[PDB]
Each structure stands twice: as C-alpha cells, then as structure tokens.
Nucleic acid binder design. Structure first.
Lengths: 100, 84, 62, 208, 50
RNA sequence: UGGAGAGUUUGAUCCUGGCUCAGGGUGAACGCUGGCGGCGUGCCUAAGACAUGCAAGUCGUGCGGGCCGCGGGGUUUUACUCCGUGGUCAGCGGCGGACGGGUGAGUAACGCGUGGGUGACCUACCCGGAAGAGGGGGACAACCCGGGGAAACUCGGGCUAAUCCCCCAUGUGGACCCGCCCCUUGGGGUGUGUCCAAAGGGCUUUGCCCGCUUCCGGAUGGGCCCGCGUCCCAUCAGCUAGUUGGUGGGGUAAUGGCCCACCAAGGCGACGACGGGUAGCCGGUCUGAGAGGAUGGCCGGCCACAGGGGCACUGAGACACGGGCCCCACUCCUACGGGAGGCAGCAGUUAGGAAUCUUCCGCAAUGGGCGCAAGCCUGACGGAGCGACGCCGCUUGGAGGAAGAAGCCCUUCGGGGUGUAAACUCCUGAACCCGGGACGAAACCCCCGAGGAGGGGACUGACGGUACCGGGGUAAUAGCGCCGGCCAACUCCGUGCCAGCAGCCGCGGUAAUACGGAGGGCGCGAGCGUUACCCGGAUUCACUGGGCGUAAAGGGCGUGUAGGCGGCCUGGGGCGUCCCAUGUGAAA
C-alpha cells in the first residue's frame, strides 16, 4: 500500500521536476471545525510533461533527490492557474511584513 | 533465534509461571511475542498443566527450541509424544 | 529566616533548614528553622509542638 | 489499636450503650444507667448543634466503633464496595458485617468484640476446615465456621454457648452447639439483620 | 589487566592482513582493467576479467 | 451510574474579583514516635572523582604440543629414550566480545508514539530443498637457539602440522555484460560468452555422529521512505551557497548531491522557516465528574551516550563499555631511560545535599557462551540485611468490678470529672524454647525402543530447621496533632501590644477558649505532624465552560489582503461525514 494524494502542481521552474502544493483536511481535536493546510509534496516528472496549474495525482516513492520524495501519476486537469494565483498572492503577502 | 521458556510472575515467594515462547535476546521479563500457557511446579492447585499443543508442534516445526524443564513440560503435555 | 518561638540557641552556622511560610509581617517572613539539627532544638520549656519544638520525651522519670 | 482500655466509658461518649464489653455492657450498665453522657468534666452542660458534615461524620465514626477497627481497612474496602456495580452503600453494609470477628460474635461464640478477635487470632476457629487466625476474613455463601477441637474442650466458650441457647440466629448463620460450629449462608442487610443507624448519611459525608 | 581482547585483535589483524593485501591487489588490477578496456583491447583484458 | 465547598473587601447589601485552607498523589526529608510480618520500593544534587571484589569466556569429535606429574611401557639396566598418561599452560582455529547491563550529557530531531512502504535489501545459531565433498602445497605461531629490557616485554635464524591459507578440477546452482516473453521504478523464467566451490575430523567402526560447500525459500533481528500527532520565547521574521535541479558518476547490505565534476536558479516561510531556551519519546501515572492539568523511577519498550572529539580496521552484523589508532585533557607506576590504568555494568570510599541501602550466600530454580555429554563461566537471576519508605496482616490483652477510691483539673465548693479507668478477681496464649518440617525438583543424563514415543534408575536446595504442624508456655511497647473562624472538641492561674501564636481574617494595648502550662476533651494510632512540589476545586485562560455600558478589557476610525461562514432549486463527483465488516490497539 503506497499512499497517494490529489495535489496541485506548482513551480515548473525546475528541470525534470515539479513541486506539488497540496491541502489536506482534518477537523480539530477538542474544538471542532475542519482545516486545510499547506503541504507541498515533490512531484517527479521525468521530462517536465507537466507544469503550472495542471492539477495531477502525486505518488509516494523512494528518495529521488535532496529531500525530493514522491513522484507523479495520472494528470487531473488544465485551464487552471487560479489556485496557483491564490498561492503566490499569499506568498507576496508573506514577503509584505517586516521588522526593519 | 526464537526459544521457549517458563516465566514466573508471582510475588517474592509465589512460584507461579506463565509458559511462554519468544526469542533469546529478550529478557525473561519483557515483551513476549507469544506465550501459550502456564506452569506451577510448587503445586498449590492442579491448574499448573497449561500448554497449547497446536501452535506448539507448529512453532517447533518452524525452528524453535525448548530448554531444561521446558523439555520436561513438552514431554508432559504431549508435544514430544507421538503414540505410534 | 525566623524559627518557631521564644528561646534561641545558635551563635552562628547551625545549618538552619529553610522551610517556607509567610506570616503577617516581615514582607516575606518565610523559610523557618528545623530546631534540632546542629543547633536550636525547640527550647527547654514547651509541652506540645515537640514534633518540631524539639525535646524528645519530657518523661517525668521519677 | 482497637482503642482498648476504658472501652465502654466511650459508650457514654456516643451517649448510647452497646453490646461492647458483653456482660458489663448490656444488663444494667454499659457503664451506662449509672451515667450516660459524653465523658470528661464536660458532659451534661446544655449542648449546642453539630453541623451536617459533623453529625454525618459522627455516624461514620460510630460505625467504625461498633465494629471496632481502624478506619484504614474499613475506608479502603468501602471504595472497594463502590467498585462493585450495585447500589454502593447497602451492598457495602452487607459486605461490612461480613467480617468474621463480629460475625462470629453475633453468631454466638463470643461475648465481646475483644474476645472474638483475641480467640480467632490464637487459632481458635476454623472456617470450612482450615484453621487460621485472620479475623479480618470475609466469607462466601456456604462456608462452615467450625471451632477448634481444644476450643470445644475449653470452658468460657461453653459459657457463651449456654448463655445463648434461646436466641434466633441472624436468619442464615445456624448455630451447631452439637459439636460447636456455625453454618454460613446468603447475604442479609440493613433490613434483614439491622442496627439502629442511617447508612446513606455516613455514605453522604463519606466521599463529600 | 588482560581479557580475551588479545585474541580478537590478533586474529582481526590476521584476517585484515589477507583482506587488505588482496583488496589492494584487486584495486590495482581494476586500474589494469580501465587502461586495457579504454585502449580497445580485450583478450588479455578478458584475462583480467577471468 | 459518573461530580457538595468556605474565608477574605463594606456600616450594611448583592455582583465582579483575586489570594488562601478543606483533598488525592510523591524516590520523599526532617522533627515526635517506634514492635513482629509480608510484597514492593529505596541518590532527583557533580555525566565530579572513583581504591578493592564479580561483569567474557569456552572448546582437546579442528590441529602442533610445551610443562607439573603418573603406570614408569622401551630399556635384562645405566642415564634415561618414549607408548598410555591425569593434571596445567598458552598458541593456531572455531563460537560469543554487536546479548545480557547502566543512565539522561546530546537532542524539538521520521528521534518517539504511531498505520502503511521496500519493483531499493542484508541477517550465523532451526526448517524443506538439490548436487556432492578430489588433486598440489605455503606461511608463520607455539616450540627449538641466542640479545637487551626496572618493567612494557621487544629482537634475529631454524622446525611442525592442522575445520589455518591459497592454486586446478566438479556445477544442480548463484551472479554478470548482451537478448526476449509476461510482470511494470532492477519482480520471475530463460538462452548465448564467464567465475567460484567445499574441509573435513572423531568412533560404537564400512555404518554412524558434529561440521561443511553451493542455492533458494521460510522464522526472527533490523535497516532505510512515509501519513498523522508531538515543549516554551516572534522582544526567534525572514531564510539557504550542496544551497533548489539535472545528467553523469562514486558510495552503501539498498534509493537519495550522502562525496565529485558541469550546467541551470530556485528552495522553504506567518499554518511559524532561521534561531535562543527546554526536554530523551511512549504503554502509562496522580487528579478530575467528565473533557482536561501535570509528567514519564521501579516494571515493559524505543532513542542515544562509555572522560572528550575524529577514526578506520574487523565480523553475518558494531565505529564496538570491558577492543586498538591519533589527539586533547587525567590520575598512578619506575632500577627514572620510560610505561600503564578508565565500573553513566553489580556492591563500596569521598565530596555534594535536608536527603537515599550489603564491598555476604547459592548456581539449587529459571536463565544467558561454548561442548557429542557431564561440565567450567556465570553480579542475568533467585534471597537474607536495612530504613516505618509505602501499602496490606497485626500484638501490646480478655473478664467482672463504686454513685465514682485516692493523684489530679474545675467550680457559686454542691460536687462534676477524670474513670469500671484502675486497683482486685476468672481468662486465653504474643514473644520465648522442645519434636518435626517443607514446596520450590524432574528434568538434563543413564538403561530400554533407534539416540524418534512412552516408561523406568538419578545428581540436583543457597534460600533456612525458615512459611508452617504438634507441645509447654507467660498479660506483655503507646505514643502524635488540634481545643478562635474555616472544624468536631473549653473549663483554670499565668502573659500584659511586653513574651509568643501565625494557611487566610487576626489574638496579648493586665477580666486572652487563639500566647505558656494544667485538666479534661476531640482526630489518629506504628503511626502523628511540619515543609517542597502537579491538579480537582478554580466556570479563575472558561471545549461541555467565560467576559469588554460603570468590576481587568471593543482597535483612533476608515479600509481592504491572506483566512474563515456562505441566499433558492436540479443533477454529477462522494474528499470531510455516518454506520457496517474486518487488521491493530502487545504484556502488565
């Protein structure tokens, strides 16, 4: 049983490798309300036959690179970049608060 | 290698053992993978004959070994026995 | 560090064992003394708290 | 231990007399009738009022008194009774009398508590065949508190026997004065073999 | 003072004497392999392989 | 089926509100006390230092023997040559030293708890399996001779064999470059060119026993990825230069930039990266009413460290506690050139602290290393001992016995009281000795069948003449705390804001139930108090369970970013959800 998860492909900016950003569910132990958080698994694309936006399925494997675990199976869908949009927007807003 | 022994658990002076199988490394008091009975040589009550013969003959067919009074117990219950 | 009550014994040292209890003054008070150890030992005239006011057993004896 | 000494001097302490020192504590005085009220210079002033917690406490202490025991084993076995999944207090009452000292007392073979305990301690009693010494011994429905063979050949034991022949047993513990013995059965209660107390008061102060 | 630590270090020596002797010999023979294979000749490089 | 609170602010009142005590628990410590018994437990402080005893030994069914010594075989005998040889020593070799064992320095980390991955793998001691086991010889130990050395021991030539060590053969087979079929990230089968074996010893004897050689699978140990959860300070806010990524190598039992070259810039981060602190994690453990706060010793596991760092070599496997290299630091030994020693493995010494144990017994039981077996090792283990350190069992006694002795405390002197208490009586038999006495111990082995079953002869007890059975058996330790309110127990001289009490309000500013004592009394009893520490309480960090109009507290208002909550119907996915089925949730 090798565990997989439905993740949103990001960063084509690498050679033969894409980095998938995923968001998983869980309520709360002793409070309630469900939650959805950042976890970006490493998407192994042999000839960059995948890129930005295009959501796919990701697959846990053996260590292929420096921390790079996981891999990639079947593609899900294109016409995207919306989730990606939200993501990097959040990124800039990260780099919008300072102690200087 | 996996062996079989007798695991006393009683008080300071309560010779009441649980007949136990597990491997050599582990202590006489730790985690028993298996087990399969109990023994009381002191005889406070004739409950002291407890062996699980099925898994016994099996677990000896795979590659376990007895010990001293375990050789004894095994010859008792009918695990060494064969009635030709 | 204070003690139980009236009637001291020490000159210095004593190994007085810091205990621990504020009372209605000495902004802190705290950390009273064994009374027994290497000094103190209750006093010489108490008929009760010998469980820390020293004196083993008064024992009328005669 | 078990107080011992000015015993039923503490019978006026309760303000109430009891089958405690046996003879000199039933007939015309438990050190009573002579004078019944809490001992010491202060006894018959004009008393005040004990708070709920206090009176309920009192009741508990009275319980440990009639049975004559440190509240050690007592309290422990009380929570042990709370462990048994039945109505805690009452179940506790049955399993409370069940201790063989005052059991053998109200079974006959003893005049006083001190007696019963002293005797069983000396190996004078054997339940269901085995001669022991333990008085703090609870017994299951169907035992046989037989007496020792030399203890039948003793005297004050016979005195206790004949100074009884005319008393209905606690409807379960049959008296065999045929060879000195007692047959043990069932489980009574605060309605079957009662006593002048309120149990759930004690229970209510007990655990707060 | 003593203990059979003597034994084990002695014999560890021995088996390492042989070990490293043959080990280094074989390293050097592997150099032989790369030169002869790189050249484009077999037969004797094939002997190397034997 | 599982739960109670009060005190304290004001003249008085209710609410808000914090601090305090009622409770359980703990490695405890001390002060008062102290007796037998059981089962447990019993340095947390300097991971300071550690003297002396055990921890790791074993095999002669692998081999060459040196020696004490024996029958002294041979020697008609000499001196002694050597066949048996009992006892010893080490040497080669094989097996464990990688288990048993300790303890928190390191560490917030896939380390742990945990449900899975390996088509990315290794595992001797047991099993089922297939082919078998020949040929040559080489080297050094030991030993033979000789040198130095206080010692550590160190040196040069000669001998000798062997489950020591290689070279050719044997190939069912393994494994490899190239090929293919199914399987789909190097999993299976199979061809063409290649390599390797093995080693044999001992008897009861031509048959047998231990071991081997190849090869796979099975049992285990474990390795390495992952899904989740996993401690305080954001006054720790940005951060990274093997750093993100590749090809191609090297590396390891195995994938990965873990090491290397080139080339290309990302990489993670407010949901908490970078870092300081802090701690080893878990089953659990005390409380709690429940959810939770806390923490993690004995007992069970995992992680890691052997003074301190780097280290390889070795073996199946370790960077190895009782191994060595280097280094630094550190004690001790010496004939002064030079040498060695290391217990955060079990007892003990010192300092540290208020504080925490014998430098004893047995291998008998179990149990761990080797051996054909007996057996030798055996601080794993089984116990005595000690301290009330805790709980459970408990004795110090039972019986009658006054209108109430006396001693004493009080008083309006009437007595109340102490106190049936005692005294006196009848009573049993603690402790103590005498007779006996365990279990724990039937194996293993031997004889029998075959060495397989079964039966039968049998070593085998430290604990300790102890739990206990019988006899004789004698009345024989009681102490601590409170007595103003929370609290149940008050009468009497003394004390005069002085001497003291003190968890919180307060008590003595000479009529003190709160301070001393006396009496009686209340709680308890080998226990009683006092202090340190977590929590229920405390709904007082408010999830069941909070507040912000004046009691802590609404942003200076606008504003919109991430984020969260989404009006009415139809269907679609069915991630979250729900029930049902199953693996686990170990043991204790």
């Amino acid at each position: 049983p090798k565990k997989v998860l439905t993740g949103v492909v990001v960063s084509d900016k690498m050679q033969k490798t894409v980095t998938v950003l995923v968001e998983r569910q869980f309520p709360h132990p002793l409070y309630g309300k469900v939650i959805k958080r950042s976890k970006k698994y490493l998407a192994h694309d042999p000839e960059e036959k995948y890129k930005l936006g295009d959501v796919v399925e990701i697959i846990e494997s053996r260590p292929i690179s420096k921390r790079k675990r996981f891999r990639v199976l079947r593609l899900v869908e294109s016409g995207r970049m919306d989730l990606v949009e939200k993501y990097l927007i959040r990124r800039q807003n990260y780099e919008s608060l300072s102690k200087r | 290698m996996v062996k079989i022994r007798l695991a006393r658990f009683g008080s300071k002076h309560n010779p009441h053992y649980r007949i136990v199988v597990t491997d050599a490394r582990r202590k006489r008091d730790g985690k028993y993978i298996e087990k399969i009975g109990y023994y009381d040589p002191r005889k406070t009550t004739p409950d002291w004959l407890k062996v699980d013969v099925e898994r016994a003959r099996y677990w000896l067919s795979v590659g376990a070994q007895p010990t001293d009074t375990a050789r004894r117990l095994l010859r008792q219950a009918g695990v060494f026995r064969q009635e030709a | 560090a204070y003690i139980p009550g009236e009637g001291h014994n020490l000159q210095e040292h004593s190994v007085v064992l810091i205990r621990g209890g504020r009372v209605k003054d000495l902004p802190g008070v705290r950390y009273h003394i064994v009374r027994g150890v290497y000094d103190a030992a209750g006093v010489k005239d108490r008929k009760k708290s010998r469980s820390k006011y020293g004196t083993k057993k008064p024992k009328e004896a005669a | 231990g078990r107080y011992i000494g000015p015993v039923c001097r503490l019978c006026r302490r309760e303000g109430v007399k009891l089958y405690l020192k046996g003879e000199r504590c039933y007939s015309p005085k438990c050190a009573m009738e002579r004078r019944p009220y809490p001992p010491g210079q202060h006894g018959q002033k004009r008393a005040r009022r004990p708070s709920d917690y206090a009176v309920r406490l009192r009741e508990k202490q009275k319980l440990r008194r009639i049975y004559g025991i440190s509240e050690r084993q007592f309290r422990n076995l009380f929570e042990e009774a709370s462990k048994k999944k039945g109505v805690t207090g009452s179940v506790f009452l049955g399993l409370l009398e069940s201790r063989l000292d005052n059991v053998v007392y109200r079974l006959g073979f003893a005049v006083s508590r001190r007696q019963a305990r002293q005797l069983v301690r000396h190996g004078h009693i054997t339940v269901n065949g085995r001669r022991v010494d333990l008085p703090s011994y609870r017994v299951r429905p169907g035992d046989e508190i037989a007496v020792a063979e030399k203890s039948r050949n003793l005297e004050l034991i016979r005195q206790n026997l004949e100074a009884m022949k005319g008393r209905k047993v606690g409807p379960w513990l049959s008296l065999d004065v045929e060879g000195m013995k007692g047959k043990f059965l069932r489980l009574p209660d605060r309605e079957d073999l009662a006593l002048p107390v309120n149990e759930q008061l004690v229970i209510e102060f007990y655990s707060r | 003072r003593n203990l059979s630590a003597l034994k084990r270090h002695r014999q560890s020596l021995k088996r390492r004497l042989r070990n490293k002797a043959k080990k280094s010999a074989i390293k050097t023979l592997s150099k032989k392999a790369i030169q002869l294979a790189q050249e484009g000749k077999a037969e004797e490089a094939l002997k190397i392989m034997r």
